[PDB]
Design a protein around this ligand. Structure first.
Ligand SMILES: NC(=[NH2+])NCCC[C@H](N)C(=O)O
Ligand SMILES: NC(=[NH2+])NCCC[C@H](N)C(=O)O
Ligand SMILES: NC(=[NH2+])NCCC[C@H](N)C(=O)O
Ligand SMILES: NC(=[NH2+])NCCC[C@H](N)C(=O)O
Lengths: 431, 431, 431, 431
């Protein structure tokens, strides 16, 4: 950590790393992150899981880990004594099953603690003592319980000691009787009590998938929630997650987020803007209008001045046409279309880096290219957004100063004429 | 850890300290020590007790600690709760006074862990989940259990990371129920489980007390147990600690000793032969004989050679008188008396380094001066044994090469006679 | 050290980074690198220079650094000293101005050592005692020396301690006399002695410049040396650096490369294929042929298979057209152009990982596009070479599975035809 | 070191270690200690030397070590080139001899550095660059030099880094010429420039010897110098040390000291009052008077009160006889004799702990036993001074509360009467 005092200047993307670090170091205690890792992960990828969690804990951060026991107990060691795996409301365990669950959750818990230590970091075994539960479901569900309180003494002790606290889903009733707590109801209680700035689900998949097969980078629940639930291509398992994640995020401050990655990406996910998994925030709504009057042109001047680093030319704003503008509620990202020969033309796309990390730039760019299937725009040849534009474009012409892109399905010869006019437009920002 | 291999060879004793460091660095995990510590010490001397256990840790050792709830739940947190301290069997807990118990011992437990971390050491909170217990008492005692099995899972994980396992006296049952376990029976089944090299009692009292209020340095149960049980000065409570202490040591190897101290004296107690408290071993028998033919002169000569670093002069043995010889069953410590102008004289006091530390040098010495109230003996002025002789003498005369000691108050005018005769005597050893 | 093996495998590239780590950890001692850093660099950017070298140290590498004293002694401490900057042979120092040099470079030396230590890294001041030198100039220059022997005493011990050996350009003679050594001959004699895997030049300029002022990424002396010296755009001073760079590389193994950078890009330059500066290797020869029979279709069949991860389809080679083939002497990098409607088309561009990193892919590509100013080609949409193709193309069209590029500014209406033929084309590779 | 935040409470002598630690930690820079170790030590005992030095440097301390190369150069690598080892004034080195001394002191320097680092600590090789010397002794002495200036640039760097700086006796003239510096003249030169709190000589023997063969613990130059020089049992070699040592301390503040131990003793030496070798201070003069008026009875009451923790009984002073009083100039240690049945009797012996650490208690006690060959005194049986008394006694009788000692050659029958009177003296102090 002292040997990471100025080990913050050189990695393959080194400057926004600093800022993500100096933000998770707003510790309070263990209010940094509640990381839920499934039973499947500790079995099929324990080293990678460990290195990833242990990496954090050397750079100062101390997550609170909750692990399940899916494959471990719900199979490998509870089909063994031919007990068989009945699943009622969401999980039944008769009194006979209890001592096996006890011994196999504790075994995974310690398996992980040691893995973290052996990987360079520090962990703290907390199988029990956190979850105080009620039992009301006796003949209904058996010995499964619902959290009434969270003792955070053991967890706090761990943070002060610089140790990732490792929780196992074992609970205790008021009068000390043991109980099996389901891993989801457990995470919820903990996220509630701790109010973490970050909730991470480490899965083997590495994030929710979109209609095309790709990983869904950002989800902005304010605009995207309805669209997803309603969709035909979203399978039952994705909707329960989203509905759950949203239930979690509605119980946290706006600054809290959820990430869904695989252990290997976890650092990429937490320490760069672009991320490396699925980010899900409550997010913010957007205005789609063609009435320039309504927009706060001052805040836009600011947005452009910050995003591009240079200001818009004198009297660019009141002289501007506007075919449609898309601006996020906070004026931290915006897309502004004009018209060029009757073609929709993207005149400004401005997104502050911190807005880019929350997925707002994509929230804006998607509503924009949804209105404009056939889109033409340009970008300086040095612009770092060029890689993003090129993944989104369908064609491009490249000169020594500007590069014109286009979207839609038009044979190159069709857009050859509008392209030349875009190269000959005056600069709307100096330098 | 590694930054410790030197700290020590320069100490006030730094020669036999090397000896103890290696002896104790036969880890086998947590088989180094079991350290019972009453509730009274954690309350009244948390900082020093924490520094003690920290010290052990920095030097590379990892003890298993067990704390009780004397001046805590059996006072403080149930004297202002109106349950009234129920004492029947030896420690009764109703169901009502059970969730009181859980959190009283749990608070103590973390206080200890942080205090140890505060003082520079590594420790690990293991509040519950070790003692698997049978609830045999029903209504007569309440919610008290007796360890049928010991889950050393959590203990092991601590050790590997080099941590002191701070256990609490809370237990499970076959079917979950949180149950109270009294400290001593906990320590018994735990010592039986771990087979530690060293059982340590930390009390404020600082040791065990002898007839005249001094600290009883050592007890050798082979020879001393019967004596200590039938002496009237030994109070009924000391006749209890001793019996129970016997039960533990009868369940350990002969190499395993029990020590009783206070936190500030623990290091001196562990890392010196001299000790600093009350060592109690199973030890070994001793013969007291006047017939020389009934001894093993071969083993004695080995002993003399090994102990003094020089061998006995020619024919010393065939020529040796022998008023009374006191040799311990293993010939690792022996005292042999002759006669001198009628007075009893000590010709040989031979103890091997290791034997001195098991209190065998003392055992033999104590039996000899019980036979020889009036005793004369001598010692080269560089015998490091001089300090102990001095502490045992009633007088001394000093010349350059030898020093004559005597003992048993006998009017220093008639001792001028026997002192001179003692200086005159031919050597019986060379160099 | 141990707390480092993971930091990186999660990076934006974290896969080719493992390789160079493995490569740079063929220790021997200080044979990883020799890093010359000019005087102007320690004065104007001391912190950045130190974070760069500190980073290396944390990663487990220990470069041998050699610093000069441009804007220090050859200015600062002798422009208000009246000795007047004598420059004749190439670096003159009289007898009087020798103790000025001594305390100037050493001050510089410790400014560097402490700065490195401040940024978290380990370093060792070696102001003198490495360079045993011959006073070859007499009265013509004064007290300037030529390295006869390199004493690696201090350097080896630095390395062993995980330290950057910070050498200064001061040397002895056979009989003691302290003598001045100019930085370049020092680096030459040092590289010859150390035979490092890597020679690195740190300047503020950040690399070497091409015809149009951009940074020249790679130089392959085999093909490029003659071309560059007879180039009129390569200035007389740049023609000197290259000459000396050859001389260093001709005395090193073929695996020993040279980099020229600025401190901020040092990590990227060393741990990625793409680099971030100017690489210079001895490299290898390249054939350019239009005759298919002058090629080894077996060896190309391997190259292609290894580059794409898939094998060329059956009979592809016997059937292959071939306008021009560009294959490097070791068959690790090749481009094969065919014909398509009169246009030159690139059927295969195959570069192996190591070859990409030695700048051989660049070598082939550049020789290919100098023969084919007007070029058409395609690439699957998930080819990571796409980014590079994009930086080189003048246009591109994108469908789901493939993407067509073209090159050489030629009015996007006449290329609409040959693009279709390119998408139409049957694959020549499978999976 | 953080793991020595509270690792300062338990060792075989735990309370005065802290105080020495918090005193050497007044560093300024490298002003703590200049440690001279002869060539003989690095040859015949390098591991022990290193651990001894590595311990300092891990507890915060940064000594500056100067080593010679006695056995190394005066043999190991310089009888080899048949040069013969001539010693004029005190050391001659012809021009031919220079390059061997260089390579063999340097080889010794790194041998020491690597040894320390392998032993846990941190060091900084400074074979050359510290001693700037003059040569005026050309054909007389050859290439030997006497320090004219001390560059501490390298030494301060080592201190800041927490590195024991390891200096070799190699010098440099104004014009860079190499030179052989004698190890004694260098230490003289270095102590002058650094003004250390401590000057330590690490030798194989382990401290100066007294007339009896034992190690001489204290020398109080104000009182002991003249007495030693003059003595018959002090050989010429002991005289040259004493002359040199005095020459050093006379160039340091009164607070400086010299210790002469062996590496194995060095910690005991610096961190306890008793030490473990020979300590030498400029010290302070003494009053031996029989006029009670002249003594400052105010300052004496304070002394007794501090040294004993209890005050002298009401009217002990004005009723007190005083046969002779021995008081150190600062009233920090004192011996007061009265008369008892015509025998000299030591009524008070009082020494503040810190004065016992500067050797004043022994200075006071030495003039005392010189005045009183036949001395009787007493001391409580629990007094830690008893072991010192017993080493100094000629006889002693012991009861359960007090113990009477005596000096001189008197058969028990001669002192049996007075001893009884010493047992019956009133306590002249309360509690
Ligand atoms: N899938 C993503 N785009 N994630 C972006 C993550 C942004 C930010 N570093 C965070 O951890 O919250
Ligand atoms: N009370 C005593 N004198 N104990 C001696 C202790 C010797 C050794 N350190 C041990 O723990 O067994
Ligand atoms: N200027 C460049 N393209 N350099 C490439 C660097 C490749 C490799 N990492 C090396 O250091 O040799
Ligand atoms: N030979 C002695 N008695 N030395 C005493 C040393 C006292 C003190 N610890 C010091 O280092 O200065």
């Amino acid at each position: 950590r002292q040997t990471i005092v100025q080990l913050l200047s050189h990695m393959r993307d080194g400057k926004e790393i600093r800022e993500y670090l100096h933000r998770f170091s707003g510790i309070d205690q263990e209010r940094f992150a509640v990381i839920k890792v499934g039973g499947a992960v500790i079995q099929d990828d324990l080293p990678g899981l460990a290195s990833a969690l242990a990496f954090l804990q050397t750079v100062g951060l101390t997550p609170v880990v909750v692990h399940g026991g899916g494959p471990q107990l719900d199979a490998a060691l509870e089909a063994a004594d031919i007990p068989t795996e009945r699943v009622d409301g969401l999980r039944v365990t008769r009194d006979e099953a209890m001592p096996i669950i006890r011994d196999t959750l504790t075994q995974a818990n310690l398996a992980l603690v040691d893995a973290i230590r052996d990987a360079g970091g520090r962990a703290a075994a907390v199988p029990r003592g956190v979850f105080e539960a009620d039992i009301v479901d006796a003949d209904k569900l058996g010995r499964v319980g619902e959290p009434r309180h969270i003792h955070l003494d053991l967890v706090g002790s761990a943070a002060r000691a610089g140790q990732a606290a490792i929780l196992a889903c074992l609970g205790e009733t008021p009068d000390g009787t043991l109980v099996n707590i389901n891993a989801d109801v457990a995470v919820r209680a903990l996220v509630h009590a701790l109010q973490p700035y970050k909730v991470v689900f480490l899965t083997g998949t590495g994030g929710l998938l979109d209609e095309d097969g790709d990983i869904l980078s950002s989800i902005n629940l304010a605009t995207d929630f309805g669209d997803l639930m309603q969709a035909d291509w979203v399978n039952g398992g994705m909707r329960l997650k989203l509905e759950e994640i949203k239930r979690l995020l509605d119980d946290l401050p706006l600054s809290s987020s959820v990430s869904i990655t695989r252990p290997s990406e976890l650092a990429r996910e937490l320490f760069t803007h672009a991320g490396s998994g699925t980010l899900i925030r409550r997010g913010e709504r957007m205005v789609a209008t063609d009435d320039k009057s309504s927009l706060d042109l001052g805040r836009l001047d600011n947005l452009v001045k910050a995003a591009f680093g240079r200001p818009a030319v004198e009297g660019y704003w009141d002289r501007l046409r506007v075919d449609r503008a898309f601006v996020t509620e906070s004026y931290r990202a915006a897309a502004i279309t004009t018209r060029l020969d009757g073609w929709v033309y993207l005149d400004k796309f401005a997104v502050l880096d911190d807005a880019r990390g929350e997925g707002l730039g994509r929230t804006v760019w998607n509503r924009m290219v949804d209105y404009a299937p056939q889109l033409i725009w340009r970008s300086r040849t040095n612009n770092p957004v060029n890689g993003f534009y090129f993944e989104e474009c369908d064609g491009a012409v490249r000169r020594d100063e500007w590069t014109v892109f286009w979207r839609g399905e038009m044979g190159p010869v069709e857009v050859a004429d509008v392209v030349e006019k875009a190269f000959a437009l005056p600069p709307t920002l100096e330098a």
